[PDB]
Every structure is written in structure tokens, then in C-alpha cells.
Amino acid sequence: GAATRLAGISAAADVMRRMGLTRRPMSSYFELYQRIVERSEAMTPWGFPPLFQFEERLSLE
Amino acid sequence: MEVYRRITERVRGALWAHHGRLMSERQFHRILAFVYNNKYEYQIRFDRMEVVGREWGGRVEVVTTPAGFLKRVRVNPCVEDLTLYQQQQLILSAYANACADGRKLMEQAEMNIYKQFLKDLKPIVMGIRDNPEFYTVSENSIETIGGVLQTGDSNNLCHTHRTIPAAKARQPADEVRARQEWEQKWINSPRGQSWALTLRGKTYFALHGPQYRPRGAPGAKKETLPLDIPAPYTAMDEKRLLKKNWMAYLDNKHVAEVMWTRVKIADREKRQRLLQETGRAWHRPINEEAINRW
Amino acid sequence: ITFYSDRFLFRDLVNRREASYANVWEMDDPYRFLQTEQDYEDYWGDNYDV
Amino acid sequence: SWWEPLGYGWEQHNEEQKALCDVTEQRLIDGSNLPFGGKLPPFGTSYG
Amino acid sequence: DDSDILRLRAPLTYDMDSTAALHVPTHCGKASRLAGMLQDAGGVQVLD
Amino acid sequence: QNEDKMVVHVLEELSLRNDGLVMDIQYAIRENKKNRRLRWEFVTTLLPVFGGNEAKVEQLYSDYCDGKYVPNITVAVEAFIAFLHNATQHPETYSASDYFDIDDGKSSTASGTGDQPSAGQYTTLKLLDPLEGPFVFDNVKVEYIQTVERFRRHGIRAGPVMAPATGFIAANCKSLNYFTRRQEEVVYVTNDSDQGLRRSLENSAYHKTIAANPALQYLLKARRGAALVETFNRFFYRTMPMLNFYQNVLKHYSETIQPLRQAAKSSTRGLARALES
Amino acid sequence: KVPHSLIYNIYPYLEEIRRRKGMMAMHPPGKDGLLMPDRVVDNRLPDHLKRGYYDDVYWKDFFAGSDEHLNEPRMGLRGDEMRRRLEEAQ
Amino acid sequence: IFDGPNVGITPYGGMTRLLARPETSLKYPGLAEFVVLTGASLFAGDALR
Amino acid sequence: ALGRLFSEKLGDRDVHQWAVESCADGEADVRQLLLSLHEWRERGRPPSLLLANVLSKYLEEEIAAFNKGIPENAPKLQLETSDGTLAHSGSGGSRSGTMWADVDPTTFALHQASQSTRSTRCDEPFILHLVKRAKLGECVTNFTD
Amino acid sequence: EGSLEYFESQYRSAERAVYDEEGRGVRNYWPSRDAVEGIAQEEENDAQ
Amino acid sequence: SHSSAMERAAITPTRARWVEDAFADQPSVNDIMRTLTEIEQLPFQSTHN
Amino acid sequence: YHAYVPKGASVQMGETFMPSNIATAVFRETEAAAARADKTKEETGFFSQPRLNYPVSSGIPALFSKDQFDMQYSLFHRDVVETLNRHTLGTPLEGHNLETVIRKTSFDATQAVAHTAASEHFNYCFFYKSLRPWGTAPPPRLREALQLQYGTNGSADAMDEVRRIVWVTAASHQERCGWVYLVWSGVHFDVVEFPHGSCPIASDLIPLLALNVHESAYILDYGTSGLKQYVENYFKACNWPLAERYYLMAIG
Ligand SMILES: [Mg+2]
């Protein structure tokens, strides 16, 4: 049950481009790509603790 | 109702597809309403008469208005001896035969209705395709951002038809005026004189003189030139909306677009079915490059 | 606050689908809303005439 | 009254005029002066 | 024998087969309504 | 020589001075060539005169279509006759395809012509319905139809129901086509002046077998030749529509040609002195 | 379940269930309502044709300042109207 | 299974129409008689085709 | 293909001049074929049979030369109006050299005008115009000032 | 009815005033400044 | 997910051919029976088997 | 309905000219077509033939019949792709660009199969992209660059000179197996001839125009001796503005 991640990234860059999210066009795609490539090297990279994953009372530094 | 609504939407959608005209919702529903009332009138007059179906021999007679309302039942005393079940089935099948006859009449009447309706759409429909700018391309011709591509195959097979005379315009109005010129020409001539004293003549003047209708008598009192609604040359509902509020403009625009799309999809379905029936098309997609490769 | 079942309308629905009418006036007259006398009493209470 | 201040189709119409018209008669619309810089503002910034 | 299969093509009468025609819609709806319609017509009339 | 023209010469000259007119003649020619009906009528009308190969008849059809052929008046008349014969001997095919108006015996009044119009006779030769006929544009085709019907129904004779009088090639002239300058090659069969249709009829080998049919007797004797003239023209209008088509073309050409030359020279010289200046 | 308060909305539906008998339940014989395209129609013209086209129907110079309907927008225009154009251009 | 001349009766159930559509005569000429005379089963594939 | 055959043969010389040439005093109205030529070259359209007849009897040697080597079953280039309509989706695209059924006028015009061969008016002094075009480039309009 | 009549009348007059002012009989696309901006004396005559 | 191999089919194409040689356009059951009878006698080496 | 209609046939109007026999034959063909479509769907490898930007249902104008071009597209080329796929799977070259297959199999035996196939696939692709159906007139900037090199004191002499030199190079290739290119060395233009199983990318040039000098290409139409006529026609049908924009991108 793990699909391939290309459609997802081309989509998520597409949205930020068609939404007006960034003043300069590339920034959307670059940031989204970069942030993934850095996490690729991390132990258990694609899983996250449920509490620290997002906005919650206590957070990470 | 249905057959009519399909065609009316065909007209509305085509109206905005080809030229930038929108038909007022008011208008669109009033067309339909007229078909409806037509049918209603036909019902009014259809209930004044009766249809007789009959079962076994003439033993079982059923008298019923074409709408299917049951009026009288005559029965041989022979039936009285059967069973309640068979009595029931017998009268029931007589009733069915009545409904058959009535429904035959009715369907003739309906064909009549459809014809009047078409005739009434004709100034609009023709109104869109009889313009100096109206055109179509073959459906199988690829379409790209700039314009439409040539379909390659069988350079004989593609013939462009033209509705309009290319030299100076001859409109339907001119043709009706021609008709009344020949009417008066025939009338005013000898041998058109003696014909106007015949029964044929007075029949003709009965039906087709409006000018002779006494004041207050029903029907048109002049002869009317055919309606002219040239589509690209007449602003309809988009002009009022574009002045008043942009939001309603965008929404009516939207509707016309959606209807057009829907119509086109239906035409694709009928096409597909017709293609499977003759066995040129399979029952599941076998060619996915015709879809996925864009 | 009554909550009807989904098919609640079925009886009436087959009664309507199967109705037949001698002429069209009978089909839709203004007063087919009314059967018992109670109805005739509530529909005209206002005109002291009728 | 908010539609005219932003020349809407300006880059297109500029293109049309520059390509198909003589330089003697053409009216060219400049985007720098136009309200947002002739562009669509970045998402959250424009109050809507 | 052939003449008998010739016979089968003849439509249903009630004198040979003792059975009414099937016509299926109108048996669908009006089968349970029949007593109603009939007694609204004031019952049948037994003639001779 | 700038005087005598053929039809092709006219279309290729006019091709320069009227765009739309030529576009219309040519579209129409295409649509008439597409018809199965007008072809079937041409073929099965001229078949008996040659009596021969359908190759020559079909060739004559295609050539007829361009104006490159008009039938000779002799051939015309004996085609008329041939038709009357083939219609009377076996009526089944030619009363179910070539139409006659049948007498209504539920209508009876006292007159010489009207009574032979009332009982067991052929009243008139019928033209093709507007769908199966010669080309008309789809603008007006509806009104055209309505008019044709409203007229035939109530027995009005005028407009589209009446047949135009068609010309043919004279006996002494060997010419194949219509010419713009030469009017004496083209012959009309009129009521008053006749081409010998009677004298060709009575002296024909088919006269007694045609005099047998009770239904055609009115179409022979009614107004006298005014029944037999009308019958004639009507036939070749319903069979070979395009003789009149091209006729009206060349008529129109010879009419409007010189005004267009005036215009042409005037505007051309306009940009000419405007150019050198 | 359906709330008692909301049932009135079904009434028009239920209404013309009842009113559909005969002649209003009728659909035209032979006619579906879906008419597929078959041929290809184009009535478009070269401009010198559609210059003098409508002049016995409407006024002369029917297509004058019309840009979509003409490939040449300026034809037929009398001078000062042509001037209006460049005048708002500068 | 549209059968029943095998039980000595004529087939019932309306499928006869489907079998006699000009379409079926087109795609599978002779199939109609095959199934009506011989009681023989049809399956998903053939119902689809 | 017809477009560039023409634009090649005509070459430099005046459009109007050629249009007074191709018409002797009696041939056709210059206004008409001028109109149709304008609508055919830019705003790419099917040529009116007027313009097609003129062009046919003008370009006949270049068309005969473009048609000279072709194999049997391959598309030729022919101007014939024998059939009524002008829509070049009708001919097979074999009437002019067009590959398209229809191209909307504005886009076509931007395209062929993006081709520098399309002739700019240059009411300026010629050499000065060309020098400016070389030194400043087309990037002179990069600046809004 | 009767607005339209008047309206159309004055159009006809105004146009045969612009397109040829001198009644020579041929259509002129290069009219004088006075025939273009000049008012109908008919309207005046009608007030009178 | 689909293929022609995978749908359940009684009339798979040779079967269609056979059927239309047998039952197509035969105006009785008797014709059908002597047609069949004539077919069962074909050798194993005949082209048409 | 497009999906359901098989790959080859066209969807058109009923004239009702069909006898029942051929009407059944058609459905049979369609059935088999569905079958072979099902097997082609799994036989599909990594690489695939290019979509053609122009309709070839009739021939490519002034150049090819339907059968010539289609014998290239749907016979030799489609084969080349079969081989390429067969030999790029099971190897370190699985699932990379056309390039990095062309480029990393260069100049060597034992990958010779893969390289030949790949470079062939490219040559064909670029060939189709090199033909514009009614032909184009070569654009001013390219005309200028070409003049500075080939032009000897004549107007756009560079064009007839290039279209001459190409003919020459084509006739000077004896094998009748291969490709003639107009390419940009990076310092100058020139016309090269590549043998079968070699491409401009392996030799790191930048290609502008491709010409197919395989005999299979002109044999159905121009015959055995008809190469000159062939090339001459190719210039009626070639695509210049492509070569131009590629040239300008190479420059910057
Ligand atoms: Mg109840």
C-alpha cells in the first residue's frame, strides 16, 4: 500500500504555482523539493510522532 | 418534458458556443411552457371523444377515453359464468386494447406537436447557422491551442457544406414576400379569377386570408413575415446582465457552457453506442493512447 | 418532530401514479384538497357568506 | 469601479499592438504603474 | 405434424385456448385498481 | 474575339469579376451532381432515344451537367413521346415515379375541361418535391417547401409550381451548347408557336397506343396544345432542370457584364494614377 | 429518516406524478432529442463578398467597425470614424 | 440459461428480444437459434460482447 | 506553402504595384483582390477563388516546380475551385499549403509577424532604423522608460 | 410604433446628408467637416 | 485490470465461426439437422474441420 | 468512444452501404484487434515510439506516400524500439534517459546492440521532428549564420548551397544505410554523414536537421536510383525554424 511519490510532488508544486502562493514562481518548487531531500537522510524519515508532527500545545525546538 | 428539453438545451448551449449570446432563463422556460400548454390543449380536446376496445368475439366491450379513463363496460352473460379471475383478466385485456387505440391516436397527435415546436424553434436555430460567420470543423479533427488540425485520411471524404448563398443575401423574408407576390399574381389574373369563385378558391381564402377576419374573431388578422433573429447581430441577455451585475453574468455564462458540454457528451454516447452496435467498437477500452497520450 | 421512514410516501405514490380523470378540470380543480366536512369548514370560515 | 484601474488584458493587448500595428499609431499599456505591477498579487497579501 | 405449429402463430382467442391476452403494462399498474375503476363506472352491464 | 462565349468561358471570366456568383453556380452544380434522383430521371428519360449503352447516356449526363450538352429539339420531342409510350404500356413504374395528378371523383362540376379533370384522368404533370429536386440553399428551403405545398394543395398555379419554358437546339443547327451571342440556336416550345410536337405525335408510330389511354386524353385535348405544351415543358423541367439553370446563368452574364467592366477599369486606373503620382 | 418539517418539498414531484396521465406522458415517436452531427458546415466568406452582403437587408456598410466579423476592420469606414480610432490612440 | 425445449416447453423471460436484436444477428449470426433451440449457457464475456 | 511560394517570388517589390500589374484595366477590381490578399497573407485564411485564379496564373511555374518531383500517392499542391466552398478543411489542405483546418486570425498574425520577413513600415530614415535595430536590439523595449 | 418611424426618418435624412451632401448621387467616404458635425435643419423646421 | 483472455466466454471465436456455419439462416429445424449430420461426417484431415 | 475504437480504423458516418457479410467481418477484426491490444499492453517496455505532431493518415506532402512513411514508422522503427527495449532491460541501463543509454553505450562492442538500437531510435525520432508537412521558409537569423559560412557573394546563397552540400554528402554515402545531418560543431556549421547505428549525440554535436538516407526510406517511391529527387523533395518538406531555434539555444 505505498504508492509512488512523483505524482504527489508534481501535484503539490502545481497547486502552489496555480495558487498565487509565491511572488517568484520557482520558489514553490525549490523549497518543496529541498525540504524533502534533506529529510531523506534521516532515520525513519517518512514517519512522524503524532503529537510533534503538527501544531499542538507542546512543540519541538 | 424530456425530448423537448434536450433539444432546447441543444439550442441554448449552441447559441453561446457559436456566438457570445445568452438566452434569458425567462425565454428558455417560456419555450418549454408553450410545448406543455400545447399538449394540454390536446388533452382538453381529446377527452370529448371515446375509444372502444373489445375482447373475446364482441362479448366483452370496454369504452374508455383515449387518456385511459374507464367509462363503460358491456358484457355478455356468458362471461358471468367464468370465474372472477378470468372475468378480471378479460375486462383487463379489453381495457388494454382500448388503451392501445387511444395511445395510437395520441402518438399521432404528439408527432403533430413536435412538428409545431420545431417550426417555432426554426427562427432561432436557423438564426444561428444562417450567418456569414458560422462554421464547424469535422469532429475527428485534432484541436490544439492555436487552432484546429487537418484530418489526414481520404481527401475525398471531407466535403464542406454551405447553407448560405455566397453572393448578395437572400433571406427567408424575401421568400415569403415572393410567395405573396405570386399569390396576388395568381389572384389578379384571369383563370385566377374564375378559380377564386370555385370551392377551391373560397377554401383557400377561408384558411389563408387573415385580412378578411372580422374584428374580434380569433386568429392572426394580418399575414406575418417570418421572424428574424440573427444571432451574432442581436444582443440578448448578456448585455443586460453585463450592465447590471457581473456575478449573474458569470453564472448565466457558466450555465450555457455546462449545457453545451452536456449535450456534446450525449452526442458522444449515442455515437459510441451506434459504433458498438455495428461492431466497429469494442465493449471496453482497447485503445488507451487515444485518451492517455494527451 | 416526527421522523418518517424513507419509503413513507409509497401508498400515496401508487395512488397518484394510478389515478385517472374523466376530463382535465376534474384533474386539477381548485377544491380536490377537500373531502370531509371539516375541510369544507376550515377552507371557508372566512367568508361569512359561503 | 474596481475593474478599469487594473488594466486586465494589458500584456496581451501590448503584444497585439507591438506586433500588428504601426509604431505611429499604437497605445501601449505599462504594467509598472498599474495597481499591482500589472500582476496578480501573491496569495495572502492583497486583502482579497 | 406441421399444421399444428402453423396453428401456434394465430393470436390468442378465448374460444380455443380459454386464456386472455397478456398485455403486460396495464397488468402492471391497473391489475389491483380494477375493482375501483369498474365500480366507478357503475359496475358492468350484463347484456345478451 | 470578345463576343461569342461558352459556359465554361463565362464561369472562368466571371470567376474574376464576381466571386460569390461563381461560388454559388459551382456549389449548386456540385449538389445537383450528387443527386441520385436527377440522374435517375435523366438516364431513364433519354434511354429510349439512344436505346443503347448506358455508357453513352451516363457520359451525356455528366456532360449535360456542365452545359457542354443541350439535347437537340428533335431528340427532345421523341424523348417526350418515348416517355408517354413507356408510361402507358406498363403504368406501374411510371405512375409511381413520374407523377400525374389523379382525378377526384368526389368533386363534380359542369365544364368541358374540369369534367375531364374530375373523373379517371391525369390532370397535370407533377414536379419533384423540394427535397428531391434541383438545389436550393438551406436558408430558404423551409419557406420554399411551405410555399410549394400550400400552393399544390389549394391548386394555385404560380411561383415554384409553374415550370419555366426551356430552350433546346434547333433542327438545322448542329451546335452542342448554349451561346451568349447566338439566340437562334436556342428554341422554345411555346403555346402559340409550336415546334411540331403535334405533327411529330400524330405521325409517330406510337399514336394509337397512346390514344388508347383514357387518362392522357385530357392532357392531349384540354386547352388543346396548352395542355400538351405545359406537359412538355414541365417534363423537361422535372427531368433536366439545369438547362434552364445555365440559361438563366448566361442571361444574367450578358446582362450584368459591362457595368462590372466599367467598375473594374475605373478602380484599377484609380490606384494606377494614384500609384504613379 | 425524513423530517416531518421537510416533506412539503416533495409535493411538486408527487404532484406531477399525479398529473402525468395521458398526452403529458407522451414522447414523440421516433425522436430521442439527441441529434448527432454528420456533415461540416461553414458559411464564412472572403471580405469583399461580405462587404456588400447585407445592403438590401440592413444598411450599407453593415460590417464597419466590427473586428471579429471582419479580417479587415477598417474597410467601409468613412474617414473621420477612422480618425476617431487613432484619436483615442493618442 | 434461456432453455426449456429440453423440458418440453418454449423459452420464457423476454431474453428472446435480446437474441433477436439486429445487433446480435450482426455480431454472431446463428447464435440466436443456437441458444433458443439448444439449451446452452451464456456467460459474462458473451453478454458483454 | 502557397504563402511562402508567393512571398518568395514577389520578393521585395510593392504589393500594390503587383496588384495593379496582375490586373490589366479590365481584369478585376483591385480593391477586391487587395482585400483578399491582405486577409490571406496575415490573418491567414483560405484565399478567395478570385485571388486563387490570379495567383494560379501568376505563380504557375513555382507551383509546377514544387510539384515536379513528387511520387504518385503523396499530396500534391493544387489550386482548383471546382467545388464551391473555400474552407481548406474541405480540400484536404491540398488547396493552399495548409496543414490546418482553421487557425484563429490573431494568433496566426502574431506568428507570421514574429517572422522578421514580415515587412515593417520604417517611415524613419532606413539606415538609421537598421542601425538602431542592430545596436539597441529588440531589448530596447525591455525598458519602460 | 411612431417613435420608430420618426427615428428612422431622421436617420435616412442624416445619412443621405453625410454620405452625399450635394445630391450628385454617388457614395462618398470622405465627407466635409460640416456635413459630419452639422445639425439637421429638419428638426428645427419641425419645432417651428 | 482487464483482458480478453480473462473473461468467461462460451462463444470464443472459432465457436462463433462454427455456429454461423451451422445455425445461421436456416428456415427450419430439419434443415439444421441434415446440415449437422453432413458436418459430423467430415474427416480429421479436411481443411474445413 | 475514442478509447473503444481500435488503433488503426477511423470513426466515420454511416452511409448504410454495408452488406451483412463484411459487417460481420469487421466485428471479427475488431475482436482480434482487442486481443492483440491486450498482448501489446503487456509487451510494452520502457521506451516507446514518438507521437507524430502531424497527421500521416495520408502521406507527408510532396515527400512520402502513406505506405512509405508508414513502412518506416510502423516497420523498421518500431522494430528498433523492440530491440532497444529487449536489451536495455536486464542491464545497468534500465530506466534512464534515451541519452544516458546513447551516451554510456558509446564506442564499444558488447553493448553494441544497445547502442545501435538507441541511436537508431533517436535518429528516427529526430527525423520525424525534422519534417514539417508542407515545408517552411528558413528564418532570417539562421539565414544570416549560414551565409557567414557557406555563402559566396550571393543572396541567401547559403540556402541553395546548404541544400546542395546535403545532396552531395548523401550521394557520397555509399552504403545507403545511415543518416545525413546538418549539425553545429559548437564553433561552426557542417553537414555530416553518420553510418547506421551512430548519432550526433554520441559524437556530441548539436543536431539541427536530420535526413534519412536509408534505402528503405526512398525505395517504395523514388526507386533504387532516385535519391537525388528524394533529397530535393525533402527540402520541400523539411522543418527549418526548428533547426534555427536549436541553433540559437546552442549559442545562448
Ligand atoms: Mg393509503
The secondary structure element, H or E, covering residue L208 is strand L206-212
Q: Are F30 and F200 a contacting pair, CB within 8 Å?
A: no
Cell output for J36: 459630419
For L54, residues 6+ apart whose C-beta sits below 8 A from its C-beta are B149, I99, L60, L131, L132, L133
Which residue(s) pair with I103 in the sheet?
B147
- Sign (positive/negative) of CA torsion F252, F254, F255, F259? positive
What is the spatial distance between Cα B256 and Cα B245, in angstroms, rounded to a whole number? 17
b/e sequence D3-32, b meaning 16+ C-beta within 10 Å:
eeeebeeeeeebebbebeeeeeebeebebe
Resolution of the determined structure in angstroms stands at 3.4
Q: Do B152 and L51 touch (CB under 8 A)?
A: no
Q: For chain F, report the end-to-end CA distance as a whole number of angstroms.
A: 34
What is the spatial distance between Cα I78 and Cα I97, in angstroms, rounded to a whole number? 9
Eight-class DSSP state of H23: H
Residue F169 three-state SS: strand
Cell output for D17: 499592438
Backbone φ and ψ for F5, nearest 5 degrees, come out as: -125, 155
What is the spatial distance between Cα F176 and Cα F70, in angstroms, rounded to a whole number? 6
For L193, residues 6+ apart whose C-beta sits below 8 A from its C-beta are L169, L170, L172, L173, L178, L179, L180, L181, L213
Q: Are I30 and I23 a contacting pair, CB within 8 Å?
A: yes
Alpha-helical segments (H) within chain F: 7-17, 19-34, 37-50, 54-66, 73-89, 91-94, 112-118, 141-154, 197-202, 207-210, 217-221, 225-239, 242-276
What is the spatial distance between Cα F271 and Cα A20, in angstroms, rounded to a whole number? 56
Q: For chain J, report the end-to-end CA distance as a whole number of angstroms.
A: 24
Closest listed residue to residue F123, CA positions, set F276, F20, F230, F8: F230
Residue E46 three-state SS: strand
Eight-class DSSP state of F88: H
What is the spatial distance between Cα L193 and Cα F47, in angstroms, rounded to a whole number? 67
Residue H5 three-state SS: coil
Dump the DSSP string for F118-130.
Answer: HSSSEEEEPPPPT
Q: For chain C, report the end-to-end CA distance as a whole number of angstroms.
A: 35
CA of G11 to the centre of ligand 1 (A): 16
Cell output for L234: 525533402
Mark whether A and C touch (3+ CB pairs within 8 Å): no
B277 touches chain H (CB under 8 A): yes
What is the spatial distance between Cα L181 and Cα G71, in angstroms, rounded to a whole number? 41
Orientation of helix L78-88 relative to helix L112-130, angle to 10°: 140
- F 6-45 residues with CB < 8 A to G: 19-20
Closest listed residue to residue F31, CA positions, set B162, I94, L12, G36: B162
What is the spatial distance between Cα I54 and Cα I15, in angstroms, rounded to a whole number? 14
Eight-class DSSP state of L77: I
Preferred mutation among B168, B262, B275 to probe G, highest tally of G CBs within 10 A: B168
Which residue(s) pair with L192 in the sheet?
L181
Residue F162 three-state SS: coil
The three-state DSSP-derived secondary structure of A21-34 is CCCCCHHHHHHHHH
Dump the DSSP string for chain I.
Answer: -HHHHHHHHHTTS-HHHHHHHSS-TTS--HHHHHHHHHHHHSS--PPPHHHHHHHHHHHHHHHHHHSSS--TTS--------SS---TTTTTS-SSS-SEEEE-HHHHHHHHHSSTTSPP---S-HHHHHHHHHHT-SGGGS---
For L38, residues 6+ apart whose C-beta sits below 8 A from its C-beta are B286, K3, K4, K5
Cα–Cα distances in angstroms (integers) from residue B124 to residues B23, B231, G39, I95, in the given order? 10, 8, 20, 34
Q: Do E47 and B74 touch (CB under 8 A)?
A: yes
Q: Are B96 and E30 a contacting pair, CB within 8 Å?
A: no
Closest listed residue to residue B281, CA positions, set L27, L8, L39: L27
b/e sequence B127-146, b meaning 16+ C-beta within 10 Å:
bbbbbbbbbbbbbebbeeee
For C7, residues 6+ apart whose C-beta sits below 8 A from its C-beta are none
Residue F165 three-state SS: coil
Q: Are L197 and L116 a contacting pair, CB within 8 Å?
A: yes
Exposed (0-12), middle (13-18) or buried (19+): which is I71, by Cβ within 10 Å?
buried
Eight-class DSSP state of H49: -
What is the spatial distance between Cα L120 and Cα L196, in angstroms, rounded to a whole number? 7
Residue K43 three-state SS: coil
Task: Identify the residue whose cell numbers are 494589458.
Answer: D10
Alpha-helical segments (H) within chain B: 2-18, 25-46, 84-129, 172-188, 199-208, 238-244, 246-277
Which residue(s) pair with F225 in the sheet?
F223
Cell output for F133: 429536386
- Minimal C-alpha gap between E29 and chain B (Å): 11
Q: Are B253 and B22 a contacting pair, CB within 8 Å?
A: yes
CA of C45 to the centre of ligand 1 (A): 28
Q: Are B60 and B76 a contacting pair, CB within 8 Å?
A: yes
Closest listed residue to residue F66, CA positions, set F136, F130, F9, F2: F9
Orientation of helix A26-39 relative to helix A6-18, angle to 10°: 150
Q: How many other C-beta atoms lie within 10 A of the C-beta of residue A16?
A: 18
Cell output for F254: 450578358
What is the spatial distance between Cα L247 and Cα L189, in angstroms, rounded to a whole number? 9
Closest listed residue to residue D16, CA positions, set D8, D7, D30, D27: D27
The secondary structure element, H or E, covering residue B161 is strand B160-161
What is the spatial distance between Cα L210 and Cα L192, in angstroms, rounded to a whole number? 10
CA of C21 to the centre of ligand 1 (A): 19
What is the spatial distance between Cα I15 and Cα K37, in angstroms, rounded to a whole number? 85
Per the entry, the structure determination technique was: cryo-EM
Exposed (0-12), middle (13-18) or buried (19+): which is L119, by Cβ within 10 Å?
buried
Q: Are B212 and B205 a contacting pair, CB within 8 Å?
A: yes
Q: For chain D, report the end-to-end CA distance as a whole number of angstroms.
A: 16
Question: In B, which residues are within 8 Å of C24 by CB distance?
Answer: 40, 43-44, 47
What is the spatial distance between Cα F112 and Cα F222, in angstroms, rounded to a whole number? 8
Q: Do I81 and F264 touch (CB under 8 A)?
A: no
Q: Are B174 and L44 a contacting pair, CB within 8 Å?
A: no
Q: How many other C-beta atoms lie within 10 A of the C-beta of residue B15?
A: 23
Q: Are F65 and F184 a contacting pair, CB within 8 Å?
A: no
Eight-class DSSP state of J39: P
In this structure, the strands spanning B60-64 and B70-75 are antiparallel
For F148, residues 6+ apart whose C-beta sits below 8 A from its C-beta are F129, F130, F160, F161
Cell output for D14: 501590448
- Minimal C-alpha gap between C24 and chain B (Å): 6
Dump the DSSP string for L128-172.
Answer: HHHB-TT--PPPHHHHHHHHHHH--SSTTHHHHHHHHHHHHHHHT
Exposed (0-12), middle (13-18) or buried (19+): which is F73, by Cβ within 10 Å?
buried
Closest listed residue to residue L134, CA positions, set L22, L69, L54, L248: L54
**CA neighbours within 13 Å on the CB side: how many for E46?**
6
Dump the DSSP string for D1-48.
Answer: --TTTS-SSHHHHHHHHHHHS-TTS-----TTTSTTSSSPPPGGGS--
What is the spatial distance between Cα L127 and Cα L125, in angstroms, rounded to a whole number? 5
What is the spatial distance between Cα F93 and Cα F70, in angstroms, rounded to a whole number? 27
Closest-approach residue (CA) in chain J for G83: J30
For E24, residues 6+ apart whose C-beta sits below 8 A from its C-beta are none
- L 167-206 residues with CB < 8 A to H: none
Closest listed residue to residue L20, CA positions, set B130, H23, B78: H23
What is the spatial distance between Cα I98 and Cα I52, in angstroms, rounded to a whole number? 14
Question: Taking the mean position of all CA atoms in its chain, how far away is CA L214?
Answer: 11
Question: In G, which residues are within 8 Å of I35 by CB distance?
Answer: 46-48, 51, 72, 75
Dump the DSSP string for B208-257.
Answer: H-STTPPTT-SS-SSPPPPP---TTTS--SHHHHHHH-HHHHHHHHHHHH
Q: For chain L, report the end-to-end CA distance as a whole number of angstroms.
A: 46
Preferred mutation among G38, G48, G49 to probe F, highest tally of F CBs within 10 A: G49
Eight-class DSSP state of F168: E
Name all chains with 3 or more CB-CB pairs below 8 Å to chain E. Answer: B, C
Q: What residue type is assigned to position F105 of the chain? A: G
Task: Identify the residue whose cell numbers are 504613379.
Answer: F276
Which residue(s) pair with L131 in the sheet?
L238
Q: How many other C-beta atoms lie within 10 A of the C-beta of residue F195?
A: 20
Which residue(s) pair with F187 in the sheet?
F168
Which residues have a C–N gap over 2.5 Å right after them in chain D? none
Preferred mutation among K1, K3, K15 to probe L, highest tally of L CBs within 10 A: K3
What is the spatial distance between Cα B79 and Cα L193, in angstroms, rounded to a whole number? 102
Q: What residue type is assigned to position E39 of the chain? A: Q
